[PDB]
Structure formats: C-alpha cells, structure tokens
Design a protein around this ligand. Structure first.
Ligand code: HEM
Ligand SMILES: CC(C)c1ccc(NC(=O)O[C@H](Cn2ccnc2)c2ccc(Cl)cc2)cc1
Length: 434
C-alpha cells in the first residue's frame, strides 16, 4: 500500500556511495536481480534514492509535471554554471519559456545552413590536425573539438567567433564544469574560479551586443525574445542559456560520436561499416540537409545504438514533491526518484544481449530507450546532435578508413559526471582513402 523494496547497506554514512562508483551498472544490475524488482530504492548517505529501472514504468517517471516530479533540487549544482535564475535555477513556468526560446533556435528553420556548415568544419580540422596518411588520434579528445568546433560554427555568428574562437570557448566551458564535482547531488575558489570564467564570457558577450545594436545566430534569436510579461532576458540570463545550450552538446555528442566511430571501425562490426558505406557512398562532398535527414536512416540507427549501449547520461533525477506510484510500489514525497538510461538499456526483455552492438535492433518494450529522456522532459538538442553526429560520421567514414589499436572496444569510464569511453583507451590509427 506504500513502498518499494530497500537494499542492504553495511555501514550507513557511506550508503552505496563507493558501491555505485566502482561500477554503477554492475551494482544496479545486481540490485535489480537480487531485489527481484525492476523498481527498487537504494540509499546514499541515509538519503533515499529510489531508482525506476523497469522499462514498462518509464511513463511514471517522465510523465508527471515538475510540481509532482521536480528536477530542480537535484540539479541545483549547475546554478553557478547556468546562472542564478536560469533553467532549473529559474522557476519552472519561466523556465519553460527558456526551453521553447532555445527550442525556436534548434527549430528546423535554422538547420538549413548547418549541414554544409559543420561539414566544411570537419574537414578544416582533419586537413590541419589529421595531416599524414598514417595516423594518430585520441578520438575522444579529437571528437571533443570537432564537435565544439562545428557547433560554435553552427550557432556562433561570424562576428561572435572571431572574438571568441571555438578552440578556446571550450577553455571557458572546461573551466566552468571543473566547478562541478562528484558527490554533490545528495549532499569556494572554484565558485569564483568558475564565476570568473562566466563573468568573463558574459562581458565578452555584452561587449558584442553594443556592436550589434549600433549597426542571425542563437544569440541573435535569444535577445529578440520576450517573456510572457513582455520582459526581455537580462544580460546574464541569456549568457547562461548559451553556456547551457553549449555545455549540453559538447560532451554527450562528443562521446556519442566517439562511441559511434569506435563500434564501426571495429572489425567485429564492419558489415555495419560497409552498410554505412552503401548508404553514404553515392552521396558527394555536397552534403545537403535532405541527405543527412531524409536519407541517412541506417547511420542514424548506429548513433542511436551507440547511445543505447552506452548512454552518456547514466542517471536522471526528480525530487518527489507529491507522492507518485510506480507499478505496485509508491514513492514517498521526500524521496529522490531516479530513472537510468544505463540500467534500463540493459534490461534484457527490452534489450537482449544489451552489451552487444546491433544498430538494427529494436526495443521490444516500447519506451525502453530513454537516451534522450522522455515525457515532459524530452531532450530538445536531440535532432541537432543527431545531425552533428550523422554528418561528422559521413564526412569522416567518407574519405578514410579507421583502425583501433585494441582487440576490443574501450571500457565505459563511469568515473565522471557525464560518461563516455575511456580516455587512455581511445587512441586510433587513421589512414587516408583515395
Ligand atoms: C546528444 C546526446 C544527448 C543526450 C543523450 C541527451 C539526453 C538528455 C536527457 C536524458 C535529457 C532530459 C533527462 C533528464 O532531465 O533527466 C535531456 C534534456 C535536455 N537536453 Fe539533451 N541530450 C543530448 C543532446 C542535447 C543537445 C545537443 C542539446 C542542445 C542542443 C540538448 C539540450 C537538452 C535540453 C535543453 C534539455 C532540457 C530538457 C528538460 O529537462 O526539460 N541535449 N537531454
Ligand atoms: C537553457 C535551458 C532551456 C536549459 C535548461 C536545462 C538544460 N538542461 C540540461 O542541459 O541538462 C543537462 C544534461 N543534458 C545533456 C544533454 N542534454 C541534457 C544537465 C546535466 C547535469 C545536470 Cl546535474 C543537470 C542537467 C539545458 C538547457
């Protein structure tokens, strides 16, 4: 009549903290089987963390509006990176405007100059960093830029990038994130050390609008935005949404792209690689949007299966404000309710052989895949990242072949906020192709 089962903890203060850390997948795979339930409640620090790990129930986590399931108090962490009154740090109704504000820029209105834009960008890095017909790549780090390069290129305006190069906008981002550290979702020089990089970027920004006025891109659209009460976003409000737009893209999509390339370059998986080829071969250098979008479905599957196997975002969380029932269990207001792409995508009814990479697999429980989340919190970056990644792939597997130094694919380093493949494992020997 109330609640789902709880897991053993040997010593309380710790809870499950290192048991999670070592391997969150193993740990969760264990708990689920051992607790004979897809829905179960673990504990961090005498804080209650009840996971939603049975796929059929995802509706229960992703469907309810923020009041009933509220994300803010979980993501409070980002407030300094995003700003104090933005995204979650903003109140929800006003936040919704921000999401649609952002959404009206990733609107497929502006996607028409993107493809030819990121493509050219992929080459510019390749011809300048991939120089020889014999190759070195730390693909994870090389995709890190190729991603942040093409994106800035796509969303940063000509007058914007000159001032703030792609190469070193990363530098600000990767000085903002360093603020964000482990073990904070359930519990300063850097507050400053990061505030500085944000106040920096911000003035770098407010100094561009003056040149904008006394005289269009993500920023362009963002300033032309007026709220419900006919307000316009303050300097530092807009500043954050750019940060947030770009933070969200950089790692996920880098990882997604790397994880992606890896499986395809692998000898294990090379009927796919040549199925990619039967797909992208008759396509020319001239990449138009119809090509990526209308005529790249197989390649899309790969990227999706990449994200399926190893979701870059292991957990997503709400603070249970009202109390919500899930299957036959009930989640008590005061609990943190979580839902995990990582665990869910390894349910075997949903995804048989879940560590196997099969682009041409389909979810056998409708809704299982939650890589881009679901319900009232569906990712708004999805079609864009999907378009970045697809085009990067096409361009690269275009004129090239790839080899992995290793006998099999890198291990998911679960030792970060946003999980991608291992760093020291991700080296790849490139050779040129015609
Ligand atoms: C490419 C890999 C990506 C993955 C796997 C991903 C995954 C997700 C997930 C799971 C959520 C919501 C889940 C939760 O709140 O717990 C989400 C939300 C969001 N994503 Fe993404 N995302 C990706 C790329 C992007 C990109 C490229 C953008 C922007 C260009 C973006 C912008 C957002 C935004 C704005 C939200 C807010 C949704 C909300 O909380 O209401 N994401 N993403
Ligand atoms: C500007 C406004 C609409 C806006 C509001 C919210 C977000 N949220 C957001 O980016 O979520 C990222 C994860 N993510 C990565 C890819 N897609 C999503 C995130 C990571 C870690 C924590 Cl703790 C919380 C959130 C983005 C823009």
């Amino acid at each position: 009549k109330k609640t789902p089962p709880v897991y053993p903890v040997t010593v309380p203060f710790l809870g499950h903290i290192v048991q999670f850390g070592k391997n969150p997948l193993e740990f969760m795979q264990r708990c689920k089987r051992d607790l004979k339930s897809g829905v179960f409640t673990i504990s961090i620090g005498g804080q209650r963390v009840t996971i939603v790990g049975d796929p059929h129930e995802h509706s229960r986590f992703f469907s309810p509006r923020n009041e009933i399931l509220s994300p803010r108090e979980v993501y409070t962490i980002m407030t300094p990176v995003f700003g104090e009154g933005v995204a979650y740090a903003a109140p929800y109704p006003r936040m919704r405007e921000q999401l649609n504000f952002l959404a009206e820029e990733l609107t497929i209105a502006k996607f028409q100059n993107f493809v030819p834009a990121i493509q050219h960008e992929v080459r510019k890095f390749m011809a300048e960093n991939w120089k020889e017909d014999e190759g070195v790549i730390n693909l994870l780090e090389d995709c890190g830029a190729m991603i942040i390069n093409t994106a800035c290129q796509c969303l940063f305006g000509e007058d914007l990038r000159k001032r703030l190069n792609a190469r070193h906008f990363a530098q600000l981002l990767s000085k903002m994130e360093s603020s964000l550290i482990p073990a904070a979702v359930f519990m300063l020089p850097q507050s400053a050390r990061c505030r500085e990089a944000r106040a920096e970027l911000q003035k770098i920004l407010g100094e561009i609008i003056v040149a904008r006025e006394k005289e269009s891109d993500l920023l362009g659209g963002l300033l032309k935005a007026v709220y419900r009460d006919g307000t316009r976003m303050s300097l530092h409000e807009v500043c954050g949404m750019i940060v947030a737009a770009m933070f969200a893209g950089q790692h996920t999509s880098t990882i997604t792209t790397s994880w992606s390339m890896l499986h395809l370059m692998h000898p294990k998986n090379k009927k796919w690689l040549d199925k990619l080829h039967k797909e992208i071969d008759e396509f020319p250098a001239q990449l138009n949007y119809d090509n990526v979008m209308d005529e790249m479905p197989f390649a899309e599957r790969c990227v999706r299966e990449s994200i399926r196997r190893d979701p870059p975002l292991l957990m997503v969380m709400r603070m249970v404000k009202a109390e919500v029932k899930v299957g036959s269990y009930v989640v008590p207001k005061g609990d943190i309710i979580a839902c995990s792409p990582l665990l869910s995508h390894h349910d075997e009814e949903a995804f048989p052989n879940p560590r196997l990479w099969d682009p041409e697999r389909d979810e056998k429980v409708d809704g299982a895949f939650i890589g881009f989340g679901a319900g009232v919190h569906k990712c708004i970056g999805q079609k864009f990242a999907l378009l970045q990644v697809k085009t990067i792939l096409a361009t690269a597997f275009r004129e090239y072949d790839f080899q992995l130094l290793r006998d099999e694919v890198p291990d998911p380093d679960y030792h970060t906020m946003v999980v991608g493949p291992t760093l020291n494992q991700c080296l790849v020997k490139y050779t040129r192709k015609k």
